[PDB]
Amino acid sequence: MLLTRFIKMQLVIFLTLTLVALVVLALFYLRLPTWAGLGMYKLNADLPNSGG
Amino acid sequence: RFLDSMGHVAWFVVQAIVHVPHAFRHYRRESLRLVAEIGMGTGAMAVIGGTVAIIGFVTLSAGSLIAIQGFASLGNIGVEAFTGFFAALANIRVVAPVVTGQALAATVGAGATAELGAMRISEEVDALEVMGIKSISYLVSTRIMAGAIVIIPLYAMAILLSFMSAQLVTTIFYSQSVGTYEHYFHTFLRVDDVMWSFLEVIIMSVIVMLNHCYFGYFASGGAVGVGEAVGRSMRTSLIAIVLVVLLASLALYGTDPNFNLTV
Amino acid sequence: LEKPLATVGGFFKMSVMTGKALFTRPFQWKEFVLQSWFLIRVAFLPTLAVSIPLTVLIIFTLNILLAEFGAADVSGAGAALGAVTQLGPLVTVLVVAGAGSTAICADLGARTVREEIDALEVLGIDPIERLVVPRVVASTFVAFMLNGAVITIGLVGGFFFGVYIQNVSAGAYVSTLTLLTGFPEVLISVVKATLFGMIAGLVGCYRGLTVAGGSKGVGTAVNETLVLCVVALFAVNVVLTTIGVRFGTGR
Amino acid sequence: PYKLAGLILGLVGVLVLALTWMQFRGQFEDKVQLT
Amino acid sequence: GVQIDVTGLSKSFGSSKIWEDVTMSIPAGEVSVLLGPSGTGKSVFLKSLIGLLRPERGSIVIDGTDILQCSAKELYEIRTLFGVLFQDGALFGSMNIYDNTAFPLREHTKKSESEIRKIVMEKLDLVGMPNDGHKFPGEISGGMRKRAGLARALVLDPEIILCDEPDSGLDPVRTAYLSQLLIDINAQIDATVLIVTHNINIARTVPDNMGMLFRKQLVMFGPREVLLTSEEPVVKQFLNGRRIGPIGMSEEKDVPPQLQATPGMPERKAVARRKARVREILHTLPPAAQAAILEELDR
Amino acid sequence: GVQIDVTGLSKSFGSSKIWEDVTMSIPAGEVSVLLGPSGTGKSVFLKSLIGLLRPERGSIVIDGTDILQCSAKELYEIRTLFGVLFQDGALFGSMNIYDNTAFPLREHTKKSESEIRKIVMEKLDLVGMPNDGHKFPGEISGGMRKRAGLARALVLDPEIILCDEPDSGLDPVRTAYLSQLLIDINAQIDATVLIVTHNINIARTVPDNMGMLFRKQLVMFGPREVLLTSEEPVVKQFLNGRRIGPIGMSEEKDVPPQLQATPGMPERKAVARRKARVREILHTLPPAAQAAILEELD
Amino acid sequence: CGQWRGIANVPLPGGPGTESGSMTLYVQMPETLALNANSRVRVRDVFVGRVRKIELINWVPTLTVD
């Protein structure tokens, strides 16, 4: 049923647009690897006072 | 009357929600067709890009407005390097969700209301009931599933284009340095705000699709009544989107504003 | 591109004829009054219901961000600024394109499919002068008044919300309203409102007079009317905002 | 059963409003007062 | 009642053509009927004769003035002599029946209010709505809508009347009532009534002249006698509602005693001139048709 | 086909009432036609016989199961032996003629693609559209819409078929073609056809049984032999299209030989049963009607 | 209308000094340093009052404090 090959073109172009938009927003605009901590190691420090 | 009207819409939304698994397991092809239709528009609006193009244009306009007014005011005061950060806190919080919601309401909601009203007038709802097919499950639940599937890419594109427009307007038209803008933006933007905004937008889109499908499913008065259905559905969508964003922002940042500059 | 360009040319020709009828033929007081009241009654309650939560949200965001910044005494200033330069015109755009433009398009489509336009035409009456001109004038008048009401209600609601919830100072609010707002801002707001009303009325009337009949013609006409109004009003708002901030109060 | 679902929807709306008001006022979290 | 001369008229929507070369001559005061298979665009033709549409070619000479060339300023007077009834009546929903009828009188003439009231009441009573003038178009039936549209078209004393499908959405009894009313008005006013319909009960009893459109062409036009006794396959098939012949399954693949005016109504003048023109055509007619028409005229 | 037995039906939209009291007995396998003036609510009656509307009282007993009060699963099982021909076809514009035709037997039957294609093509050739299966509902005329609606209503081999104003938007010639197709359909699959209309060609050549609605009531129902020779003023007036009679100008004031099936078709079994029923009824008619019917039977 | 001094100088409701039992004082300042009405009256740096009117009588500014 259906599969008119015109709806399929719309579906694939929409999926490509979705993937590109999500990757660009997550990498270059939100920096998800930095927010999560990808490629980053943890360090600690002790302060006499916070200093704000 | 008023209580009965509320009960009618409550019954409609309950019936549409409970039939989502049935549509998911039995109407996959209809869901894919509706997803393609919503993502690429229909009619004479599908040649200009459909819902994607309208969302993009309106979000670009909103981001341009934010960047222009913010840079103007901050330059007049003098502290104009904050614009970047300001722009972020204008997009995620109050502008981009509401504007994307209104544009999505207009395009997709009016299209769905028109389609359902046309089917009601053309007696295709009766044709569906004659073949022993759940009309509400076939139409409204499939529309809701398609809208829930399609809202996330649409809002991601809207956020991306609003950020891009604000950055381009600030750092090209007003010739601010890209480094300062990017630093303040990436320093004073929290991904938690973006994720909660995405949840707000998903809830808002589900409510909008429910309201528009309700107005389109119970249309009456021939081809003339479809237009009045679209108008009433649009008014209700405006009110619902604004209320949803207000309540969500009040709940999320009521006690912790999730923003720190001073000590 | 040929078909959209031809439709744009038809819209321009219809608007030109509308202006010629407005400045040449006698005005229709009765139809203007009726359409003004109709547009008021279809877009008054949604106007408040969209403006009040939106201005409350913006005031809440501004107050929390300023309190974290530490300079919460200037909360009124921005509170006025946006509410005169963006919130008013944009709420007017939304509630006019959604309610009044769609209502006008639906009404003229109803008259077209019922052959009332041809009924007017066979009696020698030009449809434009009798119908479109009062509708556009009423749309402009209603948009102007609704923009004024939006700005006033938004300012008062922001004051009450901030003072009675976030414990900001009332004096620091009412005495900083005029800090970044003056005659340029209210003037550009009025210009925006009038232009938005005129454009919305023109697009609604043009789409209503060219409805496709059938069973989905009026619904498609209303949907396209709304989309065109939204896009055009947002573009015009961007242009007018740039022009207005060129003559800014702070500079 | 229209009026039954209308009452359910109204109760859901009122409860959502009350819950978001309490979250805005921070009634859920407990804090101690010092003078 | 005035003559219409349609010559070489053609129309086309897009690349598709509705019809072409519709060469006819609608007489003065004679109820003509245009009929054909549904989907041949016959309301298009009726609308073209007044100027609501623009035919691609041809001419429509009414009272010596070409409609397709005269500017919009002259048309303001040209359409003073018309009266048009639309399918649904095309009334105005914002005003009642009384105002719907009085609208042309309040628009064109400068008559006093009493004169307007007298004319509107007289014309409303003439169509069978004597005390039903205070109602609205949204709360009246289709037949009453057609009656009120006629009463709106009968106040300016027209010289041409165009009726668009006076049978749509009506059962045969009410269609017969409306046809009797149309014969009454053509007897009283002599107002060149032209009717478009695919109905047959209208096409056997009401008209004086008739013509058929088929396959985007006019197969023939003429008086009642020449057509009701014509051995042409298309006309013989359609005028009886048959099944074998030119007319196909759908568009994709392709005498009865004429109605008399009621007693107390003046004599119709269209019958005499129609019979004279029929005698001329009989001079031109084939022998079998000649004999049939001569038998008919001697009754 | 199966017999429908309407009993004491009544409908009302608010204070206004559509009809008052309708009692029928629609015989199995026979084409029946319900007539009346304009605005008598015949399409409401056609809707109610499948349950799309809810009459206030009365009963509509299909087989032995009163469907006016039954569980929704009972209704959805009943409506497999039904078929409705709406005024415009009520096709779905999103899919072509082939998909619109194959939709009912894809939603109900567990058939393969080959058998589905075979039955759909057979039903398309039956309604005379052998190669118009890939076109869309907007690319075809009204008559082709009615053809496709019929072909879609025939795929489930219904025991009842409903037809709503087949004359609407059709000239007399194409209406004659469609009526011939309806008679052929009743001859081949032997399905109880019901038609609501006011067309007089249909009312005088097509049916086997006829009923008349006027002033919100059923004046009478019966076979064509009985009704065509009726002395009742309303029936005689409407069937002869007269102007003088009870029927007013508007709602405010309120024996043809029949047409046989195409040669090559199986014998339309409803003719013999209609003759037998009218022969049994014959002893309760006025003498002139009795004489006319007796002459017609021979 | 005649005494209209702007939206900053209108006495506003709510806050300290508006409830019943609030006392009214007159403060004869030498110069008000462009002070507006609805400003805060502070005792020990605690917001405990509001200034109502800043009228000028015989060229010496007198403040009405609640």
The reported resolution of this PDB entry, expressed in Å, is 2.9
Q: In B, which residues are within 8 Å of A12 by CB distance?
A: none
Is there an interface between G and E (3+ Cβ pairs < 8 A)? no
Radius of gyration for chain E, computed over Cα atoms and rounded to the nearest angstrom:
19
Positive or negative, the CA dihedral B27, B29, B30, B35 is positive
F128-133: long-range contacts, CB 8 A cutoff, minimum separation 24: F128/E249, F128/F181, F129/F97, F132/E252, F132/F97, F133/F96, F133/F97, F133/F98, F133/F101
Contact (CB<8Å) E91/C118? no
What distance in Å separates the CA atoms of residue B67 and residue C238, rounded to the nearest whole number?
A: 11
First-to-last alpha carbon distance for chain A, in angstroms, is 64
DSSP for E105-130, please give it: HHHT----HHHHHHHHHHHHHHTT-S
Quick one: tokens of E298?
């001697």
* PDB experimental method: cryo-EM
User: 3-state SS of chain D: helix, strand, coil percent to 5?
Assistant: 70, 0, 30
Which one-letter DSSP state was computed for residue F51? Answer: T
What distance in Å separates the CA atoms of residue B218 and residue B233, rounded to the nearest whole number?
A: 12
Q: Is E208 within 8 Å of E30 (Cβ atoms)?
A: yes
If we measure between CA atoms, which residue out of F49, F70, F52 comes closest to residue F7? F49
What distance in Å separates the CA atoms of residue C73 and residue C77, rounded to the nearest whole number?
A: 9
User: In terms of CA atoms, which chain B residue is nearest residue D21?
Assistant: B251
If we measure between CA atoms, which residue out of B242, B236, B241, B238 comes closest to residue B214? B236
What distance in Å separates the CA atoms of residue B20 and residue B145, rounded to the nearest whole number?
A: 7
Any residues with CB less than 8 A from the CB of B112 and at least 6 apart, and which?
B143, B209, B212, B213, B216
Q: Which residue has the tokens 């499919």?
A: C113
Interface test with B, best of D12, D22, D24 (most B CBs within 10 A): D24
Q: In F, which residues are within 8 Å of E173 by CB distance?
A: 37, 237-238, 241-243, 245, 247
Distance from CA of A8 to the nearest CA of B (A): 8
What distance in Å separates the CA atoms of residue G32 and residue G5, rounded to the nearest whole number?
A: 15
Cβ contacts from A onto B, under 8 A? 52
Any residues with CB less than 8 A from the CB of B11 and at least 6 apart, and which?
D1, D2, D5
Quick one: tokens of B86?
């300001």
What distance in Å separates the CA atoms of residue E148 and residue E133, rounded to the nearest whole number?
A: 9
Helix (H) or strand (E) segment spanning residue G47:
strand G46-53
B9 CB within 8 Å of a chain D CB: yes
F74: containing domain: 4-297
In this complex, which chains have at least 3 CB pairs below 8 Å with chain A? Answer: B, F
Using alpha carbons, list the distances in angstroms from residue C197 to C108, C135, E212, F83: 17, 10, 51, 52
Contact (CB<8Å) C122/E91? no
In this complex, which chains have at least 3 CB pairs below 8 Å with chain F? Answer: A, B, E
Distance from CA of E78 to the nearest CA of C (A): 9
F288 CB within 8 Å of a chain B CB: no
What distance in Å separates the CA atoms of residue F215 and residue F204, rounded to the nearest whole number?
A: 22
Q: Is F134 within 8 Å of F98 (Cβ atoms)?
A: yes
DSSP for chain C, please give it: -HHHHHHHHHHHHHHHHHHHHHHHSPP-HHHHHHHHHHHHHHSSHHHHHHHHHHHHHHHHHHHHHHHHHT-GGGHHHHHHHHHHHTHHHHHHHHHIIIIIIHHHHHHHHHHHHTTHHHHHHHTT--HIIIIIHHHHHHHHHHHHHHHHHHHHHHHHHHHHHHHHHS---HHHHHTSTTSS-SHHHHHHHHHHHHHHHHHHHHHHHHHHHT---TTTHHHHHHHHHHHHHHHHHHHHHHHHHHHHHHT-S--
User: In terms of CA atoms, which chain B residue is nearest residue D28?
Assistant: B255
Any residues with CB less than 8 A from the CB of F180 and at least 6 apart, and which?
E243, F259, F262
Burial code of E249-267, b = ≥16 C-beta within 10 A, e = fewer? bbbeeeeeebbebeeeeee
| Range 5-44 of A in CB contact (< 8 A) with B | 7, 10-11, 13-14, 17-18, 21-22, 24-25, 29-32, 35
Distance from CA of C70 to the nearest CA of B (A): 7
For E35, the 3-state DSSP assignment is strand
Q: How far is CA C121 from the centre of its chain?
A: 31
What distance in Å separates the CA atoms of residue C133 and residue C18, rounded to the nearest whole number?
A: 6
Contact (CB<8Å) C118/E90? yes
If we measure between CA atoms, which residue out of B5, B18, B22, B255 comes closest to residue B133? B22
Distance from CA of A2 to the nearest CA of F (A): 7
Hey, how many other C-beta atoms are within 10 angstroms of the C-beta on G19? 9
Using alpha carbons, list the distances in angstroms from residue B56 to B209, C86, C232, E265: 20, 19, 14, 71
Using alpha carbons, list the distances in angstroms from residue E185 to E126, E158, F232: 9, 11, 32
F272-281: long-range contacts, CB 8 A cutoff, minimum separation 24: F273/F27, F273/F29, F273/F30, F274/F27, F274/F30, F274/F208, F274/F209, F274/F223, F274/F224, F274/F225, F277/F27, F277/F223, F278/F223, F278/F225, F278/F226, F281/F222, F281/F223, F281/F226
Sequence letter at residue E41: G
Burial code of F90-104, b = ≥16 C-beta within 10 A, e = fewer? bbbbbbbbbbbbbbb
Radius of gyration for chain C, computed over Cα atoms and rounded to the nearest angstrom:
21
Quick one: tokens of B91?
């997009």
Using alpha carbons, list the distances in angstroms from residue F52 to B118, B126, F36, F40: 18, 7, 21, 18
For F9, the 3-state DSSP assignment is strand
What distance in Å separates the CA atoms of residue B232 and residue B141, rounded to the nearest whole number?
A: 21
- φ, ψ for residue F276 (rounded to 5)? -65, -45
Any residues with CB less than 8 A from the CB of A5 and at least 6 apart, and which?
none
Q: What's the structural domain count of chain F?
A: 1
Q: What is the dihedral of CA E286, E231, F170, B224, to 10 degrees?
A: -10
| Range 230-249 of B in CB contact (< 8 A) with D | 247
User: In terms of CA atoms, which chain E residue is nearest residue F176?
Assistant: E243
Distance from CA of F110 to the nearest CA of E (A): 34
- φ, ψ for residue B94 (rounded to 5)? -120, -25
Q: In E, which residues are within 8 Å of C125 by CB distance?
A: 107
B220 CB within 8 Å of a chain C CB: no
B232 CB within 8 Å of a chain C CB: no
| DSSP E strand boundaries for chain F | 4-11, 19-22, 32-35, 57-62, 65-66, 84-85, 160-164, 192-196, 209-213, 218-223
First-to-last alpha carbon distance for chain G, in angstroms, is 24
Sequence letter at residue F223: P
Q: Is C165 within 8 Å of C214 (Cβ atoms)?
A: no
Using alpha carbons, list the distances in angstroms from residue B28 to A2, B143, B150, E110: 11, 12, 15, 68
What distance in Å separates the CA atoms of residue B152 and residue B154, rounded to the nearest whole number?
A: 5
Cβ contacts from B onto D, under 8 A? 50
If we measure between CA atoms, which residue out of C58, F194, A26 comes closest to residue B153? A26
Q: Which residue has the tokens 């989907």?
A: E39
What distance in Å separates the CA atoms of residue F213 and residue B79, rounded to the nearest whole number?
A: 84
List the CATH number of the domain containing F44. 3.40.50.300
Q: In A, which residues are within 8 Å of F136 by CB distance?
A: none
* Residue ranges in chain B assigned as alpha helix (H): 2-18, 20-26, 28-40, 51-77, 83-90, 96-104, 110-121, 124-130, 135-136, 142-168, 178-187, 191-217, 222-252
Hey, how many other C-beta atoms are within 10 angstroms of the C-beta on E223? 23
Hey, how many other C-beta atoms are within 10 angstroms of the C-beta on F288? 10
Is there an interface between C and B (3+ Cβ pairs < 8 A)? yes
If we measure between CA atoms, which residue out of G41, G40, G45, G62 comes closest to residue G53? G62
